[PDB]
Amino acid sequence: ETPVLEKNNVTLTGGGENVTKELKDKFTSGDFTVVIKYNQSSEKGLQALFGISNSKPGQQNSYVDVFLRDNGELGMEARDTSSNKNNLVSRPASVWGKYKQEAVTNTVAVVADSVKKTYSLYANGTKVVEKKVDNFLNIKDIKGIDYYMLGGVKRAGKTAFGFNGTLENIKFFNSALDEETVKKMTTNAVTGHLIYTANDTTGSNYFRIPVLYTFSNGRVFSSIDARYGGTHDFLNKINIATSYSDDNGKTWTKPKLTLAFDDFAPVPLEWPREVGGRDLQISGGATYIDSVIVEKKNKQVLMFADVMPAGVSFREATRKDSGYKQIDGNYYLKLRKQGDTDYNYTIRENGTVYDDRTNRPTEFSVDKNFGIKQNGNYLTVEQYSVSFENNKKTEYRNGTKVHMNIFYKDALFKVVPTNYIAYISSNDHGESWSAPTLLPPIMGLNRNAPYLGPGRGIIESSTGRILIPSYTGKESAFIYSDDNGASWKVKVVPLPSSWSAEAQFVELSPGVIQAYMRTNNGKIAYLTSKDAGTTWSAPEYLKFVSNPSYGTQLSIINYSQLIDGKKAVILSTPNSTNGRKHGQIWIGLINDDNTIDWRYHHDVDYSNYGYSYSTLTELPNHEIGLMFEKFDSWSRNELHMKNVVPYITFKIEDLKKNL
Ligand SMILES: CC(=O)N[C@H]1[C@H]([C@H](O)[C@H](O)CO)O[C@@](OC[C@H]2O[C@@H](O)[C@H](O)[C@@H](O)[C@H]2O)(C(=O)O)C[C@@H]1O
Numbered sequence: 001e002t003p004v005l006e007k008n009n010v011t012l013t014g015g016g017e018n019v020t021k022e023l024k025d026k027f028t029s030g031d032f033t034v035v036i037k038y039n040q041s042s043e044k045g046l047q048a049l050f051g052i053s054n055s056k057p058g059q060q061n062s063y064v065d066v067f068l069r070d071n072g073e074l075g076m077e078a079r080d081t082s083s084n085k086n087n088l089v090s091r092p093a094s095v096w097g098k099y100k101q102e103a104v105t106n107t108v109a110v111v112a113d114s115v116k117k118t119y120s121l122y123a124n125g126t127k128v129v130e131k132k133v134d135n136f137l138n139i140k141d142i143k144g145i146d147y148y149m150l151g152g153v154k155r156a157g158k159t160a161f162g163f164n165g166t167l168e169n170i171k172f173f174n175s176a177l178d179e180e181t182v183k184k185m186t187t188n189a190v191t192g193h194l195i196y197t198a199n200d201t202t203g204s205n206y207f208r209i210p211v212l213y214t215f216s217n218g219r220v221f222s223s224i225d226a227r228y229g230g231t232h233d234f235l236n237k238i239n240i241a242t243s244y245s246d247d248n249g250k251t252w253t254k255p256k257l258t259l260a261f262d263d264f265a266p267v268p269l270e271w272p273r274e275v276g277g278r279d280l281q282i283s284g285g286a287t288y289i290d291s292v293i294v295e296k297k298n299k300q301v302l303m304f305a306d307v308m309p310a311g312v313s314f315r316e317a318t319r320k321d322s323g324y325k326q327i328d329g330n331y332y333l334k335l336r337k338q339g340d341t342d343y344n345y346t347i348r349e350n351g352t353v354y355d356d357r358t359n360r361p362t363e364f365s366v367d368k369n370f371g372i373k374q375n376g377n378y379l380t381v382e383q384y385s386v387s388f389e390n391n392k393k394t395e396y397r398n399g400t401k402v403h404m405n406i407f408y409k410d411a412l413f414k415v416v417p418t419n420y421i422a423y424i425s426s427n428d429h430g431e432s433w434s435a436p437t438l439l440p441p442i443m444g445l446n447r448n449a450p451y452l453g454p455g456r457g458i459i460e461s462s463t464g465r466i467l468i469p470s471y472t473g474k475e476s477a478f479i480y481s482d483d484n485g486a487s488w489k490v491k492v493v494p495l496p497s498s499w500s501a502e503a504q505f506v507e508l509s510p511g512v513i514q515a516y517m518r519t520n521n522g523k524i525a526y527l528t529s530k531d532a533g534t535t536w537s538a539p540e541y542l543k544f545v546s547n548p549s550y551g552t553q554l555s556i557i558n559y560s561q562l563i564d565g566k567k568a569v570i571l572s573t574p575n576s577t578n579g580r581k582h583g584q585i586w587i588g589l590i591n592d593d594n595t596i597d598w599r600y601h602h603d604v605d606y607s608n609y610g611y612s613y614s615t616l617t618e619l620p621n622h623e624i625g626l627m628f629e630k631f632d633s634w635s636r637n638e639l640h641m642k643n644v645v646p647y648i649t650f651k652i653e654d655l656k657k658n659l
Contacts, residue, residue: 001181003171007150010170013041014162016051016152023052023148026174030138033111033173034066035185039103040165043070043606048161049108050170051153054081054144060155061086062142066110066121067161068095071581071608072630074123076110078137085135089119091128091273092638093631096190097606100654105168107186113176114138122182125191126198126643129273193646195222195243195627201254202226202241203266207645209454209553210627212617213293215301215429220245220619222627222647223258223291223303229282229386230271230640231633234313237264237285240305244430248619249649258433259305259424261286263408264384265398271640272391278639282386283395284311286407288422292468294457296485300425304468306452307420307438310409314419319448322441323416325356331440335406335413345413347406353413364413368435371403372413379404379412418448421470421479442479442490443472450477450490453502453517455555455615460532462510467533469515471501476515478533493536497521502553506569508594516571518551524573528594544586544598545575550634552580555616559624563652564599566590570655571598572614572626576607580632583611585624585655602655604628604648610638624650 004026010017036049046067053063062081068074075090096104109122117136121129139145147154150170151163177185198205204226211223226241239260243252257266264285272278287308295301308314325334325346332346335353345362348354353364365373372379385398406415422436439449450470457468468479476493495501503517513533516526523541555572562568566589576582583604588596604611604626612629619625627647632638 001173001175001177004174005172007167007170010150010167012151012163012165012167014164016159016162017150018147019150020146020148023172027139028174029114030140031112031114031174031176032139033109033175033177033182035107035109035171035182036066036167037105037107037169037188038165038167039105040068040097041103042164043097045070046161047163048151048153049163049167050150051161052139052145052148053154054142055147055154055157056144057156059144062144063153063155064137064139064142065153065161066108070606072097072610074108074121074128076119076121078112078119078142080137080142082143085137087119087133087135087137089121089129089131089133091121091641093610093641093644094121094123094128097609099605099648100650103165104190105188106190107188109182109186111176111182112138120179122186125183125187127179127183128642193648194643195252195647196224196226196241196255196645198642199268202239202257203268204228204239204241205268205271205642206231206640208629208633209290209613210615210629210645211291211293211455212615212625212627213295213456214617214619214625215295216299217429218246218620219429220249220617220625221293221301221430222252223293224645225289225291226257226266228264228266229269230278230280232281232639233289234308234315235281235284235311236287237266237282238287238289239266240288240291240303242430248621248623249625249647258303259288259422259436261288261405261407262383262402263310263381263405263410264386265400267385269386270388273640278636280393282393284313285384286310286405290452290454292452292455292457294459294466294468296466297459297464298484299429300427301430302423302425302457302485303433304421304423304452304457307407307422309407309415309417312417312419314451317418317448318416319418320446321416321418322443322445322447322449323418323420324441324445326445327356333415333438335415337413343416366406370405370407370436372406372411381408381410419451421449421452439488442488443477443492450479453504454553454613455504456557458505458507458513460507460511460513463532465532467505467513469503469505471499471503471517473500474498476501476503476517476527476536478515480533491533491536493527496539499525500551504554504556506556506558508590512594516554516556518553520549520551522547522549522551522577524554542598545573546577547574548577548579552634553613555614557616557618559618561622561652563587563656564589566597569596570616570624572616572628574611579610580612580634581610582607583609583614583628585626585650587655599659600656602650602657619649622652624652624655626650
């Protein structure tokens with residue numbers, strides 16, 4: 001299959017290029033596929049990569065184009081004036097703008113298929129959207145088409161939507177090419193920046209909440225939320241997936257499911273993006289969400305995650321019950337047997353389930369992965385699948401038998417419907433992991449566990465204290481161990497308001513640490529401890545970040561090499577009052593008095609491009625690795641998008657900009 005027209009290296013500055021002679025009436029069937037490898041010299045304005053139109057007076061709504069906006073949205077229009085049919089199909093955050101101050105080459109494509117009545121758009125190897133439309137128009141359906149142009153749309157004798165950049169290669173086909181062909185044709189260097197991809201070895205179409213960490217041995221490790229029923233926090237099914245690199249981030253392992261329940265199958269789901277439909281959620285599977293990583297002095301690695309029983313949301317969960325009882329001074333996870341009103345049971349030594357009314361063992365036990373046994377044999381429940389049947393969501397028992405689990409909605413014995421924290425440990429730097437341990441009720445018996453601040457933990461250097469950031473909704477909760485992670489305690493710090501205080505730590509000097517965190521007031525706060533986290537100052541705020549009131553998670557790390565003769569920290573955050581956008585990386589130099597000189601910053605892409613949760617690490621060669629949500633993950637317009645969490649790298653010289 002060969003193009004009706006192929007052109008190369010067309011550099012344009014808003015004026016376009018007429019190719020009417022070279023396309024006129026060549027779209028015989030009316031179907032089309034247009035594949036465009038381009039880079040933009042300026043992202044400003046609405047820009048058309050090509051335009052096929054009726055250019056006559058009064059026919060300004062008779063055209064087809066593919067367009068780009070200054071926020072990375074890719075779309076297409078197909079409009080006919082006299083039928084008054086106006087089709088617009090798009091997806092936000094589909095393309096890249098710039099990277100290290102150079103324009104990024106993207107390859108995008110549109111396919112119009114008359115038999116299916118669908119338009120499909122592709123960017124950098126991903127089919128970003130395919131939509132069936134009742135008012136479908138192919139080229140033959142639009143009346144009096146007479147002008148075909150590169151880099152604009154000719155409307156009433158004037159060039160509209162002028163493209164600024166270079167069309168490195170553009171191919172027009174007069175048929176609808178198949179999906180696999182077009183994915184391949186749009187695959188390029190941008191495609192290789194995705195570690196996790198839709199329907200890879202995780203089975204998930206969607207991801208959020210990346211975390212990077214560099215181990216002592218040189219391995220670069222990642223974890224992430226694999227979110228199956230779109231990108232919703234809740235209700236959903238979420239697993240923690242992981243992937244690692246032993247060549248300084250150049251190549252990564254196929255992702256593994258590292259924390260995952262099996263009450264619901266981990267399957268690729270086409271979550272609707274329409275107004276209304278996009279609010280759909282599943283009934284909820286048992287969930288792990290929001291990971292934190294730290295490597296211990298002895299090289300054992302810990303990973304923490306929040307744990308939610310099936311159907312339980314952060315917002316509706318109980319805040320007044322830890323899910324534990326205290327019996328003879330020991331804390332045991334409690335259970336309610338189906339049909340009881342009270343929690344009459346506890347999981348005690350060797351996972352034996354006791355009846356607390358009689359203080360005797362039952363026939364039941366719970367293994368270290370939370371599965372229930374009766375007389376030494378596993379009880380089972382049937383797994384759920386989710387599907388779409390005529391754009392209708394269905395959940396059903398799918399024929400797979402899995403172990404009954406205390407976190408499942410079908411369990412005979414159930415935990416309190418609240419949030420928990422679990423951790424797992426690895427002795428081989430992430431290749432294999434222990435069974436999970438639920439954190440004891442460190443907030444008290446009558447409070448829920450904290451919520452983790454996604455990213456890393458630290459080991460403070462003078463005491464060896466391990467610190468894990470978390471929050472409650474009104475306090476900071478700094479989880480810590482003074483015995484190399486054998487037992488855990490918490491410092492609870494009341495906050496000026498009800499912040500979603502996702503935090504990360506840095507050490508300024510021995511004993512002196514700061515916790516940087518999200519707030520609800522638009523600013524990034526930092527609290528200071530001069531005794532390795534035992535006591536904390538009142539909040540101070542960064543002067544140079546101004547965000548919306550909901551705020552976003554951040555990443556901050558210590559860096560090992562001197563910059564301008566000073567110890568340095570590296571901060572990643574959005575910085576925009578208009579959304580989760582305008583990602584920046586800031587270098588802060590530690591002054592002799594332990595204040596920070598925020599001396600340099602680098603804008604990650606253009607200012608209106610999306611940038612939400614992020615994670616930094618220092619690579620073994622002292623370059624910087626960044627993985628981030630390259631979209632606005634708060635916006636109701638950018639939910640449920642595929643392949644939007646890339647990994648990129650910077651040398652310090654790439655970052656030392658703007659002063
Ligand atoms: C991709 C896209 O959004 N196309 C729109 C287009 C652009 O929004 C606009 O040209 C970019 O500046 O606008 C279209 O509408 C014209 C219409 O816009 C209203 O906001 C205004 O009230 C009207 O006077 C008139 O300008 C267009 O036809 O250009 C619609 C198109 O779908």
